[PDB]
């Protein structure tokens, strides 16, 4: 029913600009207050901005005031967040949320403000050997996030993807593993599907005994 879907996340340089969207449905858009709320990694929620039904008026948190612009398009059921003069402080997941009291929320897009280059991960199989654990190493990338799945989505149970490390080099690395009966290692194939949108890195990798 109520759908709030975001886009526009990614890497941006300090002082650069970026525009987020939130596409909405399942309810009468133009009747609702909308706004943005953000959350820097492992830290707390912070209101960014809100905007009236008609789009005729706006409010801002002090820290982004002057630098951000909230707007809406009531015909296309879309909310925007123009973000200029970006500062490293603006690095956060950005939440789309409907109404006076945030009663519905999107899934968030992550915005990373750094001077640093994107970097594609290298992806390597993690070989095993009752039960057996096989897996995938997603090494040395920037910024977050990566998506990892198995056998093109088909394989879902027994699957665990670990939170990444931030190495002192400032790159990330993470793994994801899957527990399987060891008997199936002879007569079943395993390929991990890894996507890293900011560098257009898409990788498949077979994991063999």
């Amino acid at each position: 029913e109520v759908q709030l879907l975001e886009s526009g996340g990614g890497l941006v340089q300090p002082g650069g600009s970026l525009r987020l969207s939130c596409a909405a449905s399942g309810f009468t858009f133009s009747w609702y207050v909308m706004g943005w709320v953000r959350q820097a990694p492992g830290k707390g929620l912070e209101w960014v901005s809100s905007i009236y039904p008609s789009g005729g008026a706006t409010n801002y948190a002090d820290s982004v005031k002057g630098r951000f612009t909230i707007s809406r398009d009531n015909s296309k059921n879309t909310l925007y967040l123009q973000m200029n003069s970006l500062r490293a402080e603006d690095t956060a997941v950005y939440y789309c949320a409907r109404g006076n009291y945030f009663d519905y929320w999107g899934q968030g897009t992550l915005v990373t403000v750094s001077s640093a280059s994107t970097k594609g991960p290298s992806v390597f199989p993690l070989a095993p050997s009752g039960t057996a654990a096989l897996g995938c190493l997603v090494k040395d990338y920037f910024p977050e996030p990566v998506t990892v799945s198995w056998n093109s989505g088909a394989l879902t149970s027994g699957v665990h993807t670990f939170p990444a490390v931030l190495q002192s080099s400032g790159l990330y690395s993470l793994s994801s593993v899957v527990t399987v009966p060891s008997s199936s290692l002879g007569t079943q194939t395993y390929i991990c599907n890894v996507n890293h949108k900011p560098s257009n890195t898409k990788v498949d990798k077979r994991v063999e005994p």
Binding site: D62, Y101, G108, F162, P163, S173
Partner: protein, 210 residues
Amino acid sequence: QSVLTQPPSVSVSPGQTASITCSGEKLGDEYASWYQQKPGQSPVLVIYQDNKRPSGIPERFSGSNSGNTATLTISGTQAMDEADYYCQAWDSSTLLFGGGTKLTVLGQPKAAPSVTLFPPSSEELQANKATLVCLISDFYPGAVTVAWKADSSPVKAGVETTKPSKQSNNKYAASSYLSLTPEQWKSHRSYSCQVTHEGSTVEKTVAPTE
């Protein structure tokens, strides 16, 4: 700017009623709301305008507003209620959040880590690097110490370890990465990853393959 302060952590025994407080300047002249955020999850509104529940939110969630204090109350608490809880207040002009309260539900069974140590892939080795991967999952409480050994000796550089993070089943996960050259890796007979959790140690060992 105004602040909303919350206790950084709250612990409750199972079945009891959790109480989470929010205070700031002027909170009684304002409306309080509250949000439940689970790990890896978007926030969820549990109470708005001091003490109203959205349709869909159970009655064991309650909110009140007196003094300069809003208070969130959860009855019949169980472990699936573990989460971050944020108060929020408008009025006013701005929208203020509290720093969040972490809700620990006591009485969850101790659980030892499943550990899995991995050798470098052949591919990485042809690419002239090596990476050892130690995966630590399903442990409770969320504290681990992780040590690495080359043969029987401790490794004092090249180790990258995550802090522990709450899995959706309330247990915890962590990982540790040891970066090496192919030569370093091939020198020793073996490497070990040594994880100690609540006084007890699990260890795994891989070797070059040859």
